[PDB]
Amino acid sequence: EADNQIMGPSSYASFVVRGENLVTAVSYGRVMRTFEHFMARIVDSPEKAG
């Protein structure tokens, strides 16, 4: 074996439906994975080409 052990995450990552996501789950029935990056690339900095 070229190695004995590997690193890696100890916990599962958390996707909790926060405020923008809770409202569009309640009202439209649709959640996005990141409302925060959708805000940051539509309404906060739209011309910033990623």
Binding site: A25, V26, S27, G29
Partner: protein, 46 residues
């Protein structure tokens, strides 16, 4: 019949819009409505 039933935050107006309602929905003044009697009258699942 063209109506969604989601757990919306319903604004609580004070109008007297109960008057002649169960007879008006029977004749068809409303083009699209849902009658929820019993267990269906619930703030539905999200």
């Amino acid at each position: 019949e063209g109506v969604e039933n989601r757990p919306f935050p319903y604004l609580t107006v004070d109008a007297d819009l109960l008057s002649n309602l169960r007879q008006s929905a029977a004749e068809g003044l409303f083009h699209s409505f849902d009658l929820l009697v019993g267990k269906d009258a619930r703030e539905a699942g999200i």
